[PDB]
Amino acid sequence: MKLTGKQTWVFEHPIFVNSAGTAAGPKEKDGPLGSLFDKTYDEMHCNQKSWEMAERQLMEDAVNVALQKNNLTKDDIDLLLAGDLLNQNVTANYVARHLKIPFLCMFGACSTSMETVAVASALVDGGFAKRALAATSSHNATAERQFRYPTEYGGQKPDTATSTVTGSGAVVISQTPGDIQITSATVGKVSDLGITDPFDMGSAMAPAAADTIKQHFKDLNRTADDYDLILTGDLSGVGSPIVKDILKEDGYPVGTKHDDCGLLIYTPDQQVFAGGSGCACSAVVTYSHIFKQLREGKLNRVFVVATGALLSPTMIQQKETIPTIAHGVVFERA
Amino acid sequence: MKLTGKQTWVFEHPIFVNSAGTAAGPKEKDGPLGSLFDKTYDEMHCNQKSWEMAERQLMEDAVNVALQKNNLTKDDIDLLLAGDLLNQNVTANYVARHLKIPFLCMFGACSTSMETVAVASALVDGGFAKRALAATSSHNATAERPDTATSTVTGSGAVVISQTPGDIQITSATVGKVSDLGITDPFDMGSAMAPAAADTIKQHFKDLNRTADDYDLILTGDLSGVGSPIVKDILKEDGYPVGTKHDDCGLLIYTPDQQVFAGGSGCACSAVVTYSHIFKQLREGKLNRVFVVATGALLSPTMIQQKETIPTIAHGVVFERA
Structure with a gap:
């Protein structure tokens, strides 16, 4: 079996990452990794009318750039595994509407990243998909309308707090060498x-x-x-x-x-x-x-x-x- | 390959449903299928303090009844694929906390039912799991938060999938x-x-x-x-x-x-x-x-x-x- 131990999958067929795409917002762009992203923006709006549309543009970019690098088109993909942290997974669903690729909506909070890649790898290794596309996204402002520190009470946001990253990453998985x-x-x-x-x-x-x-x-x-x-x-x-x-x-x-x-x-x-x-x-x-x-x-x-x-x-x-x-x-x- | 055509998976190894569990609320219990459910309730609260806890109890029941029928325990399961329609998938996450089974949170609105079963079947056929548990739930109250409208069903269903004959x-x-x-x-x-x-x-x-x-x-x-x-x-x-x-x-x-x-x-x-x-x-x-x-x-x-x-x-x- 591929299942080794209690919770680990060891793939029999060699599984590779054929291409990766990433897009990020301004704060990311100016960070120490800003020069490594494929696409960046200076405004959180990402040239969009709303925050939700911005996050969508981020995923669109990551997916397209990933497909572009490996000279692929949405029609070269058999499965799409994506998820976002905002309820109902609006981002992924709408992007999937556009890709028209058989969609498997995933969601594991901020662990979606590896969830989508792990199951995608398993489906490609099991022969259920020749090419799989795993993607995820996040936007500082969208996540803020869902949950935020109630400043109205005078208290101050603790150092224990964190800040949601604005960006998106997508990867192409298959049995083709990479x-x-x-x-x-x-x-x-x-x-x-x-x-x-x-x-x-x-x-x-x-x-x-x-x-x-x-x-x-x-x-x-x-x-x-x-x-x-x-x-x-x-x-x-x-x-x-x-x-x-x-x-x-x-x-x-x-x-x-x-x-x-x-x-x-x-x-x-x-x-x-x-x-x-x-x-x-x-x-x-x-x-x-x-x-x-x-x-x-x-x-x-x-x-x-x-x-x-x-x-x-x-x-x-x-x-x-x-x-x-x-x-x-x-x-x-x- | 197992992928046939454009979007269909045909499993090579025989995949069976070893057991199924279902629990439902009052309106379901009094419906034409009410007598077929494993567990039912007369009050939407399902003996719980809140609506969210009711839905949870519903999934708990379906999972346990399904595990009980095949003489299984949470430790006999390798993967748990569940999802609910309420945001953040509270129901599945908390139930998973209790089962302590490697969890893969799924979500496809009211299609989660078959989503969980399809991918679970694929993971069992691909050899990533010896036994998989797919579950889903829904509650009329948590759902709200003419002649075209519909009414959310209050209940939950779970199934056990494996290569063992059924x-x-x-x-x-x-x-x-x-x-x-x-x-x-x-x-x-x-x-x-x-x-x-x-x-x-x-x-x-x-x-x-x-x-x-x-x-x-x-x-x-x-x-x-x-x-x-x-x-x-x-x-x-x-x-x-x-x-x-x-x-x-x-x-x-x-x-x-x-x-x-x-x-x-x-x-x-x-x-x-x-x-x-x-x-x-x-x-x-x-x-x-x-x-x-x-x-x-x-x-x-x-x-x-x-x-x-x-x-x-x-x-x-x-x-x-x-």
Whole structure:
């Protein structure tokens, strides 16, 4: 079987990333990775009438640029796996309306990034799709109309807070040889240690990432030594240290091989509090900077773990806790 | 390859439904299928403090009853594929927190029913999971937050899928694509989803070189009173008449006396009707090959506020009396 261990998929047929596209907003463009994005904007509106339309334009760009690079058209794709953090997945659904590609709407909060890639890889390895397209997007303002710090009460947004990344990433997956190769994926399970504070996501998601990372090592009988980098989605300032401790306390120290996209996307000068977040966070950083590091040879085997928080206002209203999840995928220099 | 045609998956290894569980609310319990549900309630609250907790209890029931029937425990499951129509998928996420089974949150409006089952079948056939659990739920109250309107079904259905022999067998699935003819009226879903169902049904026939004659029944999710006639016309106008082999869950779940307008709707609509009544018909032999097509409308208030249209989609799965 392809299922190895408890939660890990090891693909039999070689699965590769044929092309990757990324688009990002102004704050991203001016960040330390801004020059690596395929498309950028100076205005959050992205030349659109509304925030929702902006996020859509971001995904449109990532998808088209990805298809363009591999000299492909929407008709060369068999499956489309996408999802966004805004309810009903408006972004993906409307973009899918345009692509007219058999659509499988995914959603795992800010872990959608790797969810879509993991299942897409499995469907291409299982022979259900010759070519698959996995995409995700996020917009600072759209996510703000859904949830925001109630300033009207005079309090101040805590340092534990984070800032949603404005951008989108898309990737093309198939059995056709490429520079980057997807070798395994670990599907995570829901974790809930009891966190209730909706403003400290880092500490809430840390356990989920550690769980998935730990189960992944055990499933493949591997350790941190088997990777050049263990990249986490958006644990940011608060969660990064916490995940490194839990891993160490579990006998699987990640040491200095760990890093987080939310810490790489921006610079501590762009007033982004703890660090970056959002579905687009892990996606834009991986599809541009970590794919590149891998192509250039600066890296060989990386483990990307997108983390997500499944918390709604109505639930926190009923004294419920904040469940979290983490999904991981292993990328390697072909 | 397993991919046949444009959008259809034909599984190589035999995939079966080992067990199915369903739970429903009062209006369902008193309907013409009420006696077939595993668990029912007389109060929409389902002995819970809030509507959200009620829906959760509904999914808990369906999952446990399904696991109970096949003498299984949450630890016997490798993958959990569920989704609900309320934003952020609160129901599935919290239920998943309890099952602690590797979770893949799905969402395709009222088509989630078949989406979860189709991808679950593919992951079990591809060898990524020995046992998969697909579930969906819907609650009339959480859903709200003329003669064209519909009424959300209160209930939940769950199924267990694996390569271990069972009474019902899943032989193929057709993944649908987004359709948008231009409907903008958020109160006539039947006419908005009809095209999506017709498209998926048509592509499915062409992919497998089949016709309506190859099925004893073509079941649609919740086209209801308005969409059912429309889908039959489009199919006829396309050279693929479904004739009298068509029926809709929203027309079977309730009786035109329970004041449910056009008919039933919601993720739970197609699920509870299929996992109880149509699985049973198949076990008893009253049916042999059925094609279930769950349809969904992807419309939000904020989008309709910007003069946008209503995109829809339909996913189908072929269940066969093994």
